[PDB]
Structure 1
């Protein structure tokens, strides 16, 4: 009968649309590329929805995490579009908060619930993601440790890989 003022839930391919939209502003408007395009978004939301998480305010996605499982110590170019069911690592492909909802602890909040959410799964024993050097201290507040230069290349952009024991 109404729109919950706040709701945290796993995503479904129905939210792919909304995810890309925030990606356009969050990444493309900046570097010219984005972590996941609509097909990639629907791909992981189809194969491993339980690895995603969204914050809906008044029926609108304001934050999201799109995961997938990895089975190697470090991230590679191929892992970018892969989901290793047999893996034990939660690979955070993308994390973003809406342009209008930033700097209000939402990213931090979503990130913590996410770590707790996937660490609840029997397989997931570690979390991994890549980020620009500017965000390394940010992810460290969550237990992530810088694991050196990430091998994944994206345009002219480089990233520092980070791992979090779960």
Structure 2
């Protein structure tokens, strides 16, 4: 099979009860799902999207809504219901399906999925300088400052308008 649907607490639980799965095309910044994201599948499963092959979860993205122009340390673990931005918290490519383009395919679909919601006017995320060029492939642009620090690392804040005048 091959399905793309939102995640459930069950799914999350299924991910935690096994070994370990890859981060999006980056070493060092290995996958951190350590509950900082699990609660999102309770507060807002609509902002998650998993890729299932014959039922098996091969990749997923977990997000939440942000209601401010810029990201803050607290935003990274918050969900503001009446918010207009899809804050990406984790992009994972499971069972090592690395280098198969699955990360981009999922992301392309995720932005389209969340962009379909009338209130979600844009996607927002934090990322290591190394991954900046990557996120730019999907419409993201470096917003600027945003002094968020996961660990000790200084991340670049990325924004992606989901609303655009289609002409070509």
Instruction: Please state which structure has a larger fraction of its residues in strand.
Output: 2
Q: What CA distance in whole angstroms lies between the structure 2 residues aligned with 1:28 and 1:58?
A: 22
Q: Report what 1:143 is aligned to.
A: 139
* Residues 33 and 134 (structure 1), Cα distance of their counterparts in 2 relative to 1, 3 Å cut: closer
Aligned residues: 162
What SS class does the counterpart of residue 70 from structure 2 fall into?
Answer: coil
TM-score of the superposition, structure 1-length normalised?
0.85
Deviations 1:46-99 (A, max 9, x none): 111111000112322111100100011111111111100011000001112125
TM-score of the superposition, structure 2-length normalised?
0.84
Q: Report what 2:17 is aligned to.
A: 21
1:24-43 to 2 correspondence within 5 Å?
24-26=20-22, 37=33, 39-43=35-39
Structure 2: stretches of 5+ with no match in the other structure: 162-167
Q: What CA distance in whole angstroms lies between the structure 1 residues aligned with 2:87 and 2:19?
A: 18
RMSD: 3.0
Structure 1: stretches of 5+ with no match in the other structure: none
* Residues 96 and 37 (structure 1), Cα distance of their counterparts in 2 relative to 1, 3 Å cut: closer
* Residues 30 and 109 (structure 1), Cα distance of their counterparts in 2 relative to 1, 3 Å cut: closer
Q: What CA distance in whole angstroms lies between the structure 2 residues aligned with 1:28 and 1:55?
A: 14
Q: More deviation in 138-147 or 99-108?
A: 99-108
Question: In the alignment, does 2:98 pair up with 1:102?
Answer: yes
Instruction: Please state which structure has a larger fraction of its residues in helix.
Output: 1
Q: More deviation in 71-80 or 37-46?
A: 37-46
